[PDB]
């Protein structure tokens, strides 16, 4: 009947409204089209109404894309192509009606909503930051919900949206006029006789109805300088555009994404061939690349992506408004660069003036590029900058309520630093620290308050990567943890909570990968080759760039830290030579040039350590580093690193550097199987017998009795 | 009750001309001098008794800063009279009177001149941010400063956009207009009124706060120009300019670029009765408040008025004669519509109901803004005599003047009748 | 004696840089924001209690008028705080404090911020009087406006000349200098003092009215730059620039183009004792007088001081600590020389003798102008804390601050010690 969609008569115009009170946001589903069908036919069975308009009367987004648990609802190939052939037949119903129609946008329209949007004759949008217009198609790796890519370049153009529909990234409503998808804009309103946002969703109805009567008697026309140069001009440059794109997609990424080129063949065949006949090619394509081993776990990645952008600890009690960043440098000014714009007062501690110049010139230089790309106004830029004051000694920590240490890592100096920066701080505070190596329970037994100390570890370029990690002692209260993760998600960076251990999670898994980055050049296979060799498997940055990523000075400490405990037998397993690297005094990224450098070779030919021989090709050493990485990534939760490990590699792929289009280190028991990797290291069984030894929990349900982790 | 009182005396206003007529020749401190000499023409005051003149601009013609100093020296004042300008966006004058009454009630001086003077005919189009670095030029260093050059000559424009939100007056105008349910027909009944009364006001010819002077370049005299009446059907055809044609603010029912000046005199009451000039009004309390320029940009007056009624200790409906300042049609009826209901005093302060009820009859009868133009920083120092001679003309004894400014500041002050 | 009192609280001043160093990148409402945030760094006041901030410029960067509004909105103030600028020539700030104390003693508001902000690095070089008529341009009328043209492109310059007499600061400077029998040797003893004390003042490092901030374009921090000591023989070789070499004002002992800002806070005493901040000073009477700009152009302070001593009811020699503002060397000793004799109070008022006798010992010891530069509209709101912390540092309880302005206005007001 009318369970989610309804209209009425006002101005003799059908105001069909979109709402779904069950979830917070509305999703395109079979359960929505099952009633969205038998309304427009009644609109098409009417004659008094001469124009109609649809809108999402629920505040927030417009609609979702494909509903996350419905395309991931497992069904066989003929039905998943039947639904994705039926799903646009209802669009080819309404896109060419005799009675014209108008849609509207006042939200983050994403996914199949453009299918609803640009099929219309005339859409209308609201200029604000909340409304964005993007196509999450390649980001989950598919083709869209009804195949709108066969009328996007009819509308805006092949080269115009060809860098849109597979770049993944969204556009705000401001550039959409200069692009040409939506044509008219209307800015929202402030105060009303009704609350100051409910009128703005009820304002568009009347702007739509004053467009609507004009469409029926044609006072305005829907026929609304670089694309005009293209607009008729492709008789012969045909191959000489998508060939440039054919090698573009494999120079940006590497060739082991079989997803995005499989939307190119659409727009390759949509031009020059049968356009209406082209609407059934993707029916033979959408069922392929959804039922494949490329993006099958990518849906689970998205479930975890939305699943950890949640508070998850009760309710936030006594929210923070001030910060206290102990120490300038690269993390402190770094996390200040992100924790300043969206309403957090910060104070940035330094030792002398001589490093605040290196301080604020991050939080300014990485800020005005933001206004150089016109993503902010020129004025609000500077209020955002002036929310950040930099003290010198101490005057103002009596007002602070949350403290984050940022000093370069040591067990001895910070042990004192927590003892002198305890007295001028109130008792309802939070102390926290971004240690990377040494644990907090070794330093949580010193201060006056035992329970108001957590840990927050960041990652090194703080702007581009997008996650935090929490360090939780025995003594962390629920209010302390909730108040921490409030800063975590108000920060915007997707959180994961970790019960600690000697070496917590990320360096805990990175050093048993980094300790064999020396092992390829331990024989001397020209590790410039290794960059291509490992980016071929899928890692976005090479292992040479990983050791040029971590900083050469902390590499000896993250070698000695768990090597103090158990890193000599299976948190490592090769002779350390990085102290010989720094014996000359190489400086890493601050030396600018990386590794030919003419001095790595003298290390190995110092004394003849590589007479070694084993059949280890490139694929062999790729799976050696990956299988040890997943041996450690399955070692976690065997001691109970957290509650349930399906929360795991939402962290461990998203800042660690693990490739997407590979499901995660906790996700190779499923599409690659524990049986096959145990055959891989059982092929590797007689090599050393010491370091690569597999864990016991995954191995007992590995091969025969078809068991999985949770599936 | 022991604070010294304070008095408005006769308020000279040179008439307002739409830009492009005879004030396109002038110099932005000259009709200051004209209005001030006209003040010294009908006041008969010795020119050495006038104590502390203060003006107010918005443009600040930078060949001569602090306009009031030489603009008093030009009219032959005794130069033992200090002066300063006061620059706000729109209620510059009518910030002049309030700092003057603060200067008087401190009890140190004698009399104040307050005036507001501007010309939007010659807006300042300045040269660039970086070509003016060739000020370093003013024999090889003269070359080497000139050595670095590409084509970056572009005069940057003083786009009147309030800079806190980077958008012009009209976007916020029709936002607040459409937000409080204003139709196009209801928005122009007031536009019809604000000329239909104005032509009758000039017809009877008792709006007599006008001196003439001669423009030195062009021919004869001046008298106000922005008055034209029309019908409602001859207004809705005008396609709106501030936004795409779905919106509801056009150039017919909207302010226009006009130029002019104004002045008055403000006296202590005891010397007003000692010398013997017949006054016009007292000048009682004044609230002075601002609004956050993201939401309530031009919700100027009607967030300020119930803060001044309780300040004086009286009630709304028992006022005798308003006059609210306008800058757009509809804005003033949105400043009728919003506070003739609940929900808006609610949630933007605590627990009042309907504290704005202007009964529309005792409103802007001698046509306010949109009638004879809106100078950008000189209204207000029209408006006080347009309250004073008005409420003398009928009965009544009190009346509030309130105005809105580009930037969120409001202004509101009550004016009492003649002390006899 | 029943008038409410009034209080200066801690007076932030961003340091003054000679033009050409790191403030040649800025934007003339930005170090306003820097000085104001620095005021909100050491005051711990809730940002919603600060009532009515007022600033003062002289240049009025016209892309954003009324500097104080958005310059308070930029520092994250609650925007229920109205603001305005006040523009004079030279004592713009220190006209800010006096209209603030008038605003307080009227008894309607709570606290005042007064500050003065300018940059003479980017002076406004505007385009022409008649090329800006091409504003009429903004399809054949677009041609016909462009049809009339010869070569009349010339940027007219803001030559700082006071316009009432069409001659620069320096002509009137060395006129008044030579008119009161000032030799070149006597004119530069004071120039030696006004650096010799200044370097020692920065050496002991208790001139602590300075916040640093970082200039966003250039490298690190700021601290004052105009301080350089030299010998007397290394000064007389500098050939004078304001007049032909018979004259006696050169660029060594003269003000220089410098940029900077300043702010403070002004509190009512009863809320200063209710909230509990430790004050600095009271702020008693203020005379405010002007001089005719043909003869006594820079005879600013010493025509105003015996009008404020009799206003307060005390005597000259029993003041405890002056500080007179300077703009030229010699000017201040001509403001020593003239009133240490007769004939000048004679014939320019009636019957006093020697009402200026400053004993030179209790003078500008923490070096005033010429020490750390003279910003064109921000001095004064240095000078009050440089009186306050100074007379707290030694004994004594009273002290006058007095300044001269480009145009004949003077300023003089007495400042009392801390109320404990």
mmCIF file of C-alpha atoms in Angstrom, chain C residues 22 25-26 214-220:
data_model
loop_
_atom_site.group_PDB
_atom_site.id
_atom_site.type_symbol
_atom_site.label_atom_id
_atom_site.label_comp_id
_atom_site.label_asym_id
_atom_site.label_seq_id
_atom_site.Cartn_x
_atom_site.Cartn_y
_atom_site.Cartn_z
ATOM 1 C CA UNK C 22 57.565 39.755 8.203
ATOM 2 C CA UNK C 25 52.771 39.476 3.937
ATOM 3 C CA UNK C 26 49.817 39.982 6.248
ATOM 4 C CA UNK C 214 53.751 33.336 14.143
ATOM 5 C CA UNK C 215 53.540 35.139 10.820
ATOM 6 C CA UNK C 216 51.957 32.500 8.559
ATOM 7 C CA UNK C 217 54.109 33.145 5.527
ATOM 8 C CA UNK C 218 57.550 33.679 7.018
ATOM 9 C CA UNK C 219 59.551 31.612 9.371
ATOM 10 C CA UNK C 220 59.360 31.675 13.099
#
